[PDB]
Amino acid sequence: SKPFSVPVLTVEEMTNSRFPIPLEKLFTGPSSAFVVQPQNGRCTTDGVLLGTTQLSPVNICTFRGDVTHITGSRNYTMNLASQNWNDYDPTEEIPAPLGTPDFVGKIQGVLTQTTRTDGSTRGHKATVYTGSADFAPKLGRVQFETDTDRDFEANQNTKFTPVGVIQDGGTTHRNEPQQWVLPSYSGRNTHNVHLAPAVAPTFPGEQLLFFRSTMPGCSGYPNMDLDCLLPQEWVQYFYQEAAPAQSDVALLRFVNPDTGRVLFECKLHKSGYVTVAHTGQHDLVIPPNGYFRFDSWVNQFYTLAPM
Amino acid sequence: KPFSVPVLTVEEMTNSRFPIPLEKLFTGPSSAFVVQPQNGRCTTDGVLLGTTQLSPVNICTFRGDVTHITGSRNYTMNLASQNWNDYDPTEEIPAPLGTPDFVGKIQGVLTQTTRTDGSTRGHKATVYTGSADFAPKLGRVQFETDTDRDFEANQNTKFTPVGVIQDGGTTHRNEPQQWVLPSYSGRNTHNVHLAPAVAPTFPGEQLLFFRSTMPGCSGYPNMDLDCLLPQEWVQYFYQEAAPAQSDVALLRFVNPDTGRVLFECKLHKSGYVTVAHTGQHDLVIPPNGYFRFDSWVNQFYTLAPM
Ligand SMILES: CC(=O)N[C@H]1[C@@H](O[C@H]2[C@@H](O)[C@@H](CO)O[C@H](O)[C@@H]2O[C@@H]2O[C@@H](C)[C@@H](O)[C@@H](O)[C@@H]2O)O[C@H](CO)[C@H](O)[C@@H]1O
Numbered sequence: 001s002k003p004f005s006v007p008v009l010t011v012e013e014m015t016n017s018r019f020p021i022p023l024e025k026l027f028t029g030p031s032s033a034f035v036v037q038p039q040n041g042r043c044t045t046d047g048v049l050l051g052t053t054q055l056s057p058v059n060i061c062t063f064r065g066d067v068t069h070i071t072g073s074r075n076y077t078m079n080l081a082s083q084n085w086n087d088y089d090p091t092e093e094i095p096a097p098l099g100t101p102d103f104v105g106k107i108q109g110v111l112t113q114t115t116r117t118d119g120s121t122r123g124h125k126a127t128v129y130t131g132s133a134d135f136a137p138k139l140g141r142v143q144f145e146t147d148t149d150r151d152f153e154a155n156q157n158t159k160f161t162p163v164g165v166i167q168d169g170g171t172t173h174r175n176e177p178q179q180w181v182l183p184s185y186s187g188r189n190t191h192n193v194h195l196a197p198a199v200a201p202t203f204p205g206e207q208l209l210f211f212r213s214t215m216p217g218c219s220g221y222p223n224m225d226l227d228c229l230l231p232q233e234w235v236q237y238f239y240q241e242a243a244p245a246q247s248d249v250a251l252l253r254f255v256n257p258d259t260g261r262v263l264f265e266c267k268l269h270k271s272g273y274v275t276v277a278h279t280g281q282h283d284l285v286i287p288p289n290g291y292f293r294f295d296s297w298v299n300q301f302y303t304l305a306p307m
Numbered sequence: 308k309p310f311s312v313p314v315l316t317v318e319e320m321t322n323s324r325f326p327i328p329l330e331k332l333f334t335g336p337s338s339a340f341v342v343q344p345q346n347g348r349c350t351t352d353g354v355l356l357g358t359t360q361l362s363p364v365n366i367c368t369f370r371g372d373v374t375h376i377t378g379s380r381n382y383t384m385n386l387a388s389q390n391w392n393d394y395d396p397t398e399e400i401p402a403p404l405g406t407p408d409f410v411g412k413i414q415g416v417l418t419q420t421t422r423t424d425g426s427t428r429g430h431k432a433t434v435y436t437g438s439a440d441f442a443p444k445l446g447r448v449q450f451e452t453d454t455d456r457d458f459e460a461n462q463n464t465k466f467t468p469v470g471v472i473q474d475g476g477t478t479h480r481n482e483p484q485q486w487v488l489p490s491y492s493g494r495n496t497h498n499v500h501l502a503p504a505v506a507p508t509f510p511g512e513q514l515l516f517f518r519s520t521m522p523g524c525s526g527y528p529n530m531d532l533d534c535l536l537p538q539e540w541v542q543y544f545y546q547e548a549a550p551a552q553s554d555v556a557l558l559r560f561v562n563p564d565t566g567r568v569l570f571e572c573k574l575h576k577s578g579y580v581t582v583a584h585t586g587q588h589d590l591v592i593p594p595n596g597y598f599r600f601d602s603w604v605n606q607f608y609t610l611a612p613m
């Protein structure tokens with residue numbers, strides 16, 4: 001059976017799986033006080049995609065469809081299509097369209113549109129509030145706030161390109177976004193379905209290891225921290241390789257190729273997340289050429305050396 | 308290590324010249340002009356070329372600090388590297404990795420964070436890559452924005468690209484010009500360290516292009532964007548680094564439903580694809596179709612017409 005492996009890529013060469021931006025660093029912290037249940041960047045080590053996860057790094061937090069103007073406002077409702085412009089099927093056994101944002105916040109970007117007949121084009125500043133009663137991507141509709149009440153046309157292909165996040169600066173700083181609070185994918189007063197499960201370390205002394213980026217901020221004082229469980233490149237790689245898991249835990253070493261030495265070891269769990277032996281919040285200090293390498297499959301009793 | 312290409316459909320892959328998905332395959336003649344893109348350039352044995360780097364989300368992004376051009380809404384960005392380290396103009400590359408490789412007007416958003424208090428801001432911005440002051444190789448690019456006061460000096464600033472524009476008062480689709488390289492060091496300078504121009508050499512053959520449609524943000528732009536390799540192929544070859552056993556890898560495009568070959572093509576070692584066809588042609592492919600490496604061939608192999 002095919003041997004398992006992970007990509008030979010540095011952290012900085014890789015991409016966040018929850019927003020279309022580069023990874024910056026590795027971070028570990030306790031998470032017993034809240035639920036860690038992201039829906040993007042979810043994949044098993046043998047390559048089964050979970051939650052709302054799909055393969056394209058650039059389609060994460062993008063929307064495509066057609067728009068209808070909400071009379072008396074500068075707001076539009078997008079009737080969602082699939083990422084390839086085919087019809088979106090709300091009965092599919094997924095929480096929401098693939099690539100839908102998996103946190104509550106205000107995401108700013110640009111809504112662009114092309115008129116099919118003459119190739120005329122237009123673009124407008126736009127924000128989607130993923131905590132809104134009318135954020136209902138699972139049902140196929142999302143509301144955007146824009147800076148126009150007239151420029152967008154009906155029945156024309158329209159795209160939302162995400163840029164960053166905002167916060168209302170009149171209130172406590174860094175109180176939004178809330179990266180670990182899932183949206184209600186079917187709108188107000190609904191229950192989410194088909195979720196990738198919440199994750200937690202079980203082993204004494206262990207914490208999750210997070211792949212961390214800083215989202216661009218577009219206004220106010222947002223919390224720009226964004227942690228994913230797997231780099232997007234690992235999702236892509238496991239999907240291609242489809243190597244069977246020989247146990248529930250793959251032991252990885254983080255190696256400095258400059259010296260040939262292991263900096264730390266960690267557990268890549270079969271269901272698609274990483275733990276390390278550490279207590280407390282810590283930005284890992286790593287050499288720039290460092291990368292992860294698969295060592296072996298281990299049993300349920302394997303104890304990691306302190307990170 | 309045996310050579311191979313990824314099992315990904317065209318629609319599952321990403322353009323290597325702008326951060327958007329692939330849509331389709333196109334072939335056409337290109338003997339009348341120079342095809343020399345600098346992004347999406349990689350050899351089959353994993354050597355990166357031109358301005359090519361590995362992540363699709365960094366293509367056509369800029370990072371640095373900005374200085375206000377007084378009496379205007381324009382800002383000069385002093386470029387940093389993707390990780391905010393110093394940009395080194397002496398590196399033997401044409402321009403910073405991911406620099407746009409076509410002349411046009413790219414619209415996006417300029418964002419900024421103030422280090423001390425975490426205050427943030429974002430403004431509509433356009434970079435004209437044909438401008439005299441587009442000099443990314445020297446570490447400077449100019450943005451036109453919708454503010455004359457909101458950006459601060461000495462604070463981390465990023466440009467996120469969204470799409471392209473055109474001046475609608477003039478002939479439609481006359482810009483951008485995807486096959487015209489910028490002068491990376493500005494006006495009256497010559498580019499250095501370029502990935503080479505590509506052309507078919509075999510009679511009856513044409514380049515095969517991996518095509519997307521860039522978003523348009525204003526006017527009547529030419530939104531066609533053709534790359535020589537999907538970004539995922541750059542990533543895959545860089546990862547695999549399989550030695551090339553000849554200068555030409557024969558690929559078959561297969562329909563997995565029927566097992567039947569739709570067409571075959573040549574993947575050249577230096578990193579581009581050719582097919583046997585004459586004229587402009589949008590390929591009609593099944594959505595689940597994919598490329599399969601079958602064998603290395605010599606310089607004399609004749610493709611089946613497609
Ligand atoms: C739409 C618009 O005209 N935006 C201006 C505006 O933006 C302000 C405004 O939205 C207030 C409302 O409470 O919130 C902020 O003050 C916001 O400014 C933005 O966030 C602050 C914290 C700073 O980081 C600032 O740089 C950023 O623009 O006013 C600002 C300047 O005050 C700009 O002029 C926007 O274009």
Ligand SMILES: CC(=O)N[C@H]1[C@@H](O[C@H]2[C@@H](O)[C@@H](CO)O[C@H](O)[C@@H]2O[C@@H]2O[C@@H](C)[C@@H](O)[C@@H](O)[C@@H]2O)O[C@H](CO)[C@H](O)[C@@H]1O
Nearest residue numbers: 115120121122123124148151152474475476524525526527
């Ligand atoms: C800059 C701005 O505020 N944009 C407006 C404006 O945009 C126009 C304008 O820039 C002219 C200048 O010659 O060029 C276009 O007409 C542009 O409109 C954009 O492109 C045209 C072809 C249409 O597709 C249009 O929908 C698109 O906005 O005026 C327009 C109204 O026509 C909008 O109000 C923009 O926000």
